[PDB]
From a paper:
IAV strains are named according to the antigenic similarity or serotype of two major viral surface glycoproteins, hemagglutinin (HA or H) and neuraminidase (NA or N), which also play key roles in binding and release, respectively, from receptors on airway epithelial cells. Influenza HAs bind sialic acid (N-Acetylneuraminic acid, NeuAc) containing glycans (sialoglycans) on cell surface glycoproteins and glycolipids as their primary biological receptors. Previously, we and others have demonstrated that over time, IAV HAs within the human H3 subtype have evolved more complex receptor specificity, selecting for elongated α2–6 sialoglycans featuring at least three linear LacNAc (galactose linked β1–4 to N-acetylglucosamine, Galβ1–4GlcNAc) repeats beneath the terminal species-defining sialoside moiety. By utilizing a variety of structural techniques, we provide evidence that this enhanced mode of receptor-binding has evolved over many years to include mutations outside the traditionally defined sialic acid receptor-binding site (RBS).
Numbering used by the authors:
A (entry chain A), C (entry chain A), F (entry chain A): 9 to 325
B (entry chain B), D (entry chain B), E (entry chain B): 1 to 172
The structure:
């Protein structure tokens, strides 16, 4: 009678379709998805240190908007900015706003050290009803509005040396009075001059008097500027008016910190990768959830699915 | 497949083989059975696991990067920021789908090869005691009980033991 | 006698050379070119809406150069700028010229709506012989040169609200008189001030008196600026001289529109892809015609030919 | 080729076969003819058409982008605009020429495989009735008229019908 | 390898073959020797040299580019300059390591193929005068002196000369 | 007895491990490294023309810092800036410093042609003890400090036509006096104005009076600017003070020139590729020495080794 010996392979009733070089629909015994398509819908607070800004932009928490007082001296790996955030102090703008937001975000801290400048002949602590703190007219916590004293404004010339072992970030600004009369009412002359300088940098601003639309009944504006002072360098402020003075410096660190716009809630979980949609698993090498990512993340691609075959061609009976 | 075994001279696969990827089905005087082959199954699984170890859990850490969404019109620099990110995404999208298409073509071909390797190993074992029926099955021209079948699957089969009986049956 | 059965393959007398991984010159039965190397030498006017600028730059058509009057309120998918184009009005420059050209090009329209500002105490419709329209001294169609009236220039303070459902693009500017005397002859004082602002932006320009080389016998210059007003926002112009006023706003759209520098003529044909050399077929995935493209286009590479083998190796008899 | 048939043990191709990519040439008592094989030809053409469908007519739509030619010197931002575009072109130029070189190597190898597949299918059909002459041709050891040749090309050839005649001729 | 010869049915390589990549080892009445095969060795070396000619000495000239190191904090434009360079390096790092992994897989497979090609060429030469022992060696069933061995290595071996002697020894 | 014929392949006792698609550690008979990992530690002065800046930045050699006098009219393919370089003249800064450094580096020359401007009513050749040349107070070689003559400063209006066949690069600047008194001591009025212009460009600078920290006992500062004059165009300087005048123009070329920060010494050898670590061989297609390269260079990758297999799998006895 003899015998018959047959060589063969396995098959499954439920195969998976994959793409190949010669065929874009071919069935294999098994495959695995290489594109992460979903998030858990929330941002895990581990392992990265998450700082929820809630109602505050990072820039507002930097200057000292009253609703952002709880953010003083906070640190973060990822600062989360909400779309509901709003400013609620003196109306201001920042020339190259994105660069300051970027430098503070990558530094990852609001650690602030108060300093005693010699504002001898001026009125400190200028306030306004547009910036309300504890049911009272106030101002940015980290800025010092200087006005005249005895209807005179003396030409300031103040020094601040950097004897630390790190760089200093000074936030200052210039006031833009809405009218030529306000420029007299505040600084007792029509020509304000500002010259902030170090051994490595010089900055000069002139106020621009004119009417802007009113925000919280204020037609005036503030323009924020910043200066970096190296170790061994010296800050030198020389102004005859309209100067929004710094109250001190921020430590500028360098690390893994950044910022992300997201409305996803923060959750109690662990995930290396964060997207504005929420955290995603990072076992797969690709993802189509969001091009904006933070951490050990799969690379963003525009394909919704890419199945890697993990078995032979499926030929069922 | 590029070797012509799977979906080739083997008409279909065995849904009933759940303990191996490749194996034997026999028919002798003691009945008909099925057994999986360890070496060929492990060779295919090892190769596929080597692909997975390159792709699974191998992500890159990126922290502070550039902005990628914009609410207002700005101009030259924003155009470049968008163009840089769109350029990067298109290149990685090309890399990703080309990688999968290439690997799937190779995965189908390497699994086809292991099947062909096992068939050739079995054919060389039988020498002049069997003939290729063309569909992946061998016509064995001697009495091959269960122990004789296991000796082929275990690579201990001696063709000289059955050669005279087989050559006699083959040449009537 | 028996029989002989031979297995074999086909061959051709005229094979094609292709590159491979192991051999850079190998003959196959047939191949196909994957790099588009030629254009038809003209720009097909279908399916994309082509707007030939001819003698006009897009910026000149925006301001209202007399030779560009036919471009008023035109729309386009691709604006084609010719190298022969030239300005022929008051001499001007645009700080960040490329950004304004880019924003108008991507918007894809010059739709303009006239608006009535309250220029009560000034002389409107200032003209010049450098800008000739219909054999007569004229000015940019969309700009309003304001000068003194009765040898006085009253400090302007004008408002314009955005009650529409789209953003407004306002084009304005500042005049730079060639001499200190011209600054008196035009605006009846030596100090011009300009402050254009909204609730989201502020811009301040001071004229710069001085002699520039003469273009059409004009040593003065205009500097063009722009401002975007959101729905619900308000435009606020506050100036004491040298203001080139806006006559209205442009609609800023968002779509597929752009701009391309090209001297290729426009033809009556259909082609998805446009290059400055002219339209190219887009059946191939690559092209070495031009890195500048518009539409569904093959990707630019620096190879002149890349032949994809479409047949087996050629082994002729 | 990596399978060794085309430009391998087959010395050359047939310029006279214009209706197929692979086929048979025979020599029997009734003459000598040529016929193309449908399945193997379609298998190679299908695979190549799958490559073309991935590459032909699959372009990307781009509209407003960055400037790429410059008449005057500007500085930092223009340097980046040029560097971004030059970087992108080099990567796509690498992608394009690597893609063609890889696909051409695979195309030559898959067409070599189909030729080898057809030869193996024919060899298994003949069993002990023919012997491999080494150049892609089989020496058939029995009278095989035209109908017998068509039965091999149509996969209806029964080796048992001619086995006794063939084995007798083979072993003189 | 995907063809199953090297590290497959051939148990190991010959460290003593220093004049060729593939070759023959024989055992006859006049002793046992070793000889390299020219065609198969040159075929593998030519293919590898084709890969090297694509990669060695084919660098790109770049002169004035963008800055890539920065001592001070600047802002938006510096972030893009860093992001552009980091994006470019990651893509070329991906290109480089994927290229090597793909080529090494192909190089191992093409060298495995040349070994399989030479074995098949030798098997077809011997016809019915030898049998496959399964380990890359042929059992030759006739007296094959040194001249007979050289005739196989030189592709001048005539199987008809020894067929009657071989068929007689094979079928006892 | 018969015969036995064995088919086989070669092997080596010393194999090399390589990566593959299915296995990341596999031994082959031979491999070649595709990633250049080392430099010779010096910059070969062939085939590229190397200009060692030593103690001088390219910008300092441009202006005319006394220690950089030996760099006058020099050309280069690669200018090498040392980290030890330091400025030693009047304290200055350059708005968009990197763009000027880039344009001069890519031009590849300091070829300078002196020109006679009509500085009729002013005192030329202003000097300072912060810029010492030959044990004597001096100034930047290519700049002309103009001060008052007979305690008056006449409004300058000077022309310079470009009748050459190439573009001209003019380097000029503005002086920022430390005090309002210094502004009188130097230019006999409190308001300096500067307007450098052509038919294609206009630039306007106002001095910013104020105290900066002292460098070589100078609290004043200079701000450097540049202007490009096309063939057929005309330079036009119009100033009433604080003008650091140009003494001529530089030729702006276009070619393969660039600049590289490096402390590697220059050697007597030949190498197409230069990195800040030194020259590297360019036979391999990749390298992990430095992302900064000049010349025909292997592409930078972040892998330390990538071995390309040049032989079969190694199976020793
Ligand atoms: C002994 C004697 O007689 N001395 C003389 C003085 O009388 C005289 O003082 C000046 O007198 C004029 C007379 O009309 C005027 O009252 C001056 O005060 C300004 O008044 C205007 C109009 O009411 C007011 O503008 C209003 O401001 C509010 C909001 O106000 C605050 C805010 O923002 O909450 C109040 C803050 O304290 C103030 N900040 C500081 C640091 O002073 C700010 C600031 O002034 C503005 O934000 C600047 O833009 O404003 C609201 O916006 C209304 O719409 C707006 O009309 C000014 O704010 C008042 N200025 C001040 C400094 O309070 C008064 O100084 C003196 C000088 O002329 O002459 C003596 O001889
Ligand atoms: C009753 C009485 O006596 N009243 C007094 C007035 O006389 C006096 O008026 C001023 O008198 C002076 C006296 O010399 C002078 O004439 C003033 O007019 C200027 O004259 C200069 C020199 O001719 C002229 O400059 C010339 O301009 C032309 C080109 O001209 C136009 C143009 O560009 O086509 C003409 C346009 O209308 C004008 N645009 C506007 C909005 O006014 C422009 C513009 O002035 C310039 O483009 C600014 O750069 O110029 C050519 O370029 C020549 O090369 C150039 O020399 C000025 O253009 C004249 N200015 C005006 C406004 O026309 C005259 O005003 C009055 C004031 O001093 O005092 C009364 O008491
Ligand atoms: C006949 C008669 O009586 N005529 C009257 C004149 O007396 C009078 O002249 C002015 O008189 C005042 C009186 O105090 C003063 O002396 C003026 O000179 C300035 O003096 C200050 C203080 O000493 C000095 O500042 C010092 O500068 C040094 C460094 O000096 C140089 C340098 O940088 O090396 C010297 C250079 O020549 C000079 N460059 C030029 C082009 O002039 C520069 C330049 O002045 C600064 O670099 C600008 O920042 O300085 C050091 O830095 C010290 O720390 C610093 O205090 C000024 O430099 C002196 N100015 C000049 C131009 O030399 C003197 O002019 C006249 C005008 O008031 O009135 C007549 O009636
Ligand atoms: C250049 O031109 C602009 C034109 O807008 C001027 O700016 C305007 O200035 C006026 C004051 O001069 C501002 O008017 C103030 O606005 C508030 C309006 O509140 C009422 O109306 C709004 C809707 O419009 C309601 O939401 C609100 O509930 C109120 O019904 C008032 O708060 C102000 O005072 C009011 O209360 C006081 C106290 O009771 C009364 O004395 C007043 O009469 C009034 O009732 C005041 O009316 C206006 O807002 C400004 N607009 C903008 C856009 O800024 C600039 O001032 C001008 N330049 C110069 C130099 O003057
Ligand atoms: C950085 O900071 C410094 C100071 O730290 C500023 O420099 C000071 O600013 C001004 C510059 O204009 C100087 O003040 C001026 O004083 C002059 C009057 O001189 C007085 O002293 C002399 C001494 O002999 C007497 O003879 C004379 O009678 C005066 O008593 C005038 O130009 C101005 O004074 C005005 O007001 C006074 C007081 O009411 C009136 O009596 C006068 O008539 C006049 O109307 C002016 O105030 C001051 O001296 C400078 N100091 C130094 C050391 O130079 C910088 O300006 C500042 N920089 C910036 C950018 O902010
Ligand atoms: C700072 O310095 C610059 C120096 O250039 C001054 O600018 C120059 O100003 C003068 C007038 O002061 C301008 O001269 C005018 O130029 C025209 C020249 O036309 C003739 O020449 C050209 C070739 O140069 C030919 O192509 C042309 O066909 C003519 O042959 C004239 O049109 C002007 O007037 C002419 O006609 C009138 C009427 O007939 C006569 O009254 C005149 O005499 C003359 O014939 C005039 O000559 C010169 O163009 C300006 N150059 C530049 C580069 O701008 C600035 O003015 C100075 N700053 C200050 C504040 O003054
Ligand atoms: C945005 O727009 C607003 C207006 O819409 C501008 O604000 C106006 O600008 C100036 C600011 O300097 C103001 O005008 C000035 O008036 C003063 C004179 O006061 C007159 O009124 C008082 C009222 O009691 C009388 O006592 C007095 O006698 C005057 O009659 C002077 O500073 C100036 O006037 C000059 O000219 C007049 C007329 O010839 C002479 O009689 C004077 O002696 C003097 O020489 C000056 O003209 C005006 O009041 C402001 N309005 C408001 C509401 O504040 C902004 O400046 C503008 N902003 C920008 C950036 O453009
Ligand atoms: C705004 O505020 C700043 C504050 O810094 C002022 O700038 C300072 O101005 C003073 C002069 O007014 C400068 O002082 C000068 O500094 C030198 C110091 O040298 C000694 O000290 C250093 C260490 O500090 C040692 O290394 C050195 O060897 C010395 O021991 C001196 O060279 C100057 O003069 C010296 O010599 C002369 C001649 O013998 C004597 O007359 C002097 O008394 C002194 O001994 C002088 O002392 C100081 O450097 C400035 N600092 C900065 C940071 O710039 C601005 O001037 C002020 N604004 C205005 C308008 O005044
Ligand atoms: C580019 O360069 C040009 C010059 O090449 C500059 O233009 C000159 O600058 C000023 C502009 O303000 C002008 O000079 C001024 O002169 C006036 C006095 O007029 C004199 O001439 C008339 C003629 O009839 C006489 O009647 C009168 O009595 C004067 O003799 C005044 O405004 C100024 O003079 C002051 O000083 C003098 C001398 O001490 C005093 O007698 C006066 O009382 C007064 O106090 C002023 O100096 C000059 O005319 C302009 N030239 C031209 C051709 O326009 C540009 O300003 C310059 N641009 C820049 C940006 O720098």
């Amino acid at each position: 009678p003899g015998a018959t010996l047959c060589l063969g392979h396995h098959a499954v009733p439920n195969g998976t379709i994959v793409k190949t070089i010669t065929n874009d629909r071919i069935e294999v015994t098994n495959a695995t998805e290489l594109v992460q398509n979903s998030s858990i819908g929330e941002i895990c607070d581990s392992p990265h240190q998450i700082l929820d800004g809630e109602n505050c932009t990072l820039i507002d928490a930097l200057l000292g908007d009253p609703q952002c007082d709880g953010f003083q001296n906070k640190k973060w790996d990822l600062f989360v900015e909400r779309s509901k955030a709003y400013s609620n102090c003196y109306p201001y703008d920042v020339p190259d706003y994105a660069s300051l937001r970027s430098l503070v975000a990558s530094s990852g801290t609001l650690e602030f050290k108060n300093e005693s400048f010699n504002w001898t002949g001026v009125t400190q602590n200028g306030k306004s009803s547009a910036c309300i703190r504890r049911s009272s007219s106030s101002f940015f916590s980290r800025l010092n509005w200087l006005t005249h004293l005895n209807y005179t404004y003396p030409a300031l010339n103040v020094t601040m040396p950097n004897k630390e072992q790190f760089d200093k970030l000074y936030i200052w600004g210039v006031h833009h009075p809405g009218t030529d009369k306000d420029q007299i009412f505040l600084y007792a002359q029509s020509s304000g001059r500002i010259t902030v300088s170090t051994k490595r940098s010089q900055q000069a601003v002139i106020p621009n008097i004119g009417s802007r639309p009113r925000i919280r009944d204020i037609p005036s504006r503030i323009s924020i500027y910043w200066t970096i002072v190296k170790p061994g360098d010296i800050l030198l402020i020389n102004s005859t008016g309209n100067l929004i003075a710094p109250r001190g410096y921020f430590k500028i660190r360098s690390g893994k910190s950044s910022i992300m716009r997201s409305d996803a809630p923060i959750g109690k979980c662990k995930s290396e990768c964060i997207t504005p949609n929420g955290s995603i698993p990072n076992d797969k090498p690709f993802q189509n959830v969001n091009r904006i990512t933070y951490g050990a993340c799969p690379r963003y691609v525009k394909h919704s699915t890419l199945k890697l075959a993990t078995g032979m061609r499926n030929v069922p009976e | 497949g590029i070797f012509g075994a799977i979906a080739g001279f083997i008409e279909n696969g065995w849904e009933g083989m759940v303990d191996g990827w490749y194996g034997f089905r026999h028919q002798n005087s003691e009945g008909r059975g099925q057994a999986a082959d360890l070496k060929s199954t492990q060779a295919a699984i090892d190769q596929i696991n080597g692909k997975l170890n390159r792709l699974i859990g191998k992500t890159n850490e990126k922290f502070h990067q550039i902005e990628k969404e914009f609410s207002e019109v700005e101009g030259r620099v924003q155009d470049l920021e968008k163009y840089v990110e769109d350029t990067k995404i298109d290149l990685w999208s090309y890399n990703a789908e080309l990688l999968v298409a290439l690997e799937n073509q190779h995965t189908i071909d390497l699994t086809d090869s292991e099947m062909n390797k096992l068939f050739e190993k079995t054919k060389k074992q039988l020498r002049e005691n069997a003939e290729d029926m063309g569909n992946g099955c061998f016509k064995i021209y001697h009495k091959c009980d269960n122990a004789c079948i296991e000796s082929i699957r275990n690579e201990t089969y001696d063709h000289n033991v059955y050669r005279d009986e087989a050559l006699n049956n083959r040449f009537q």
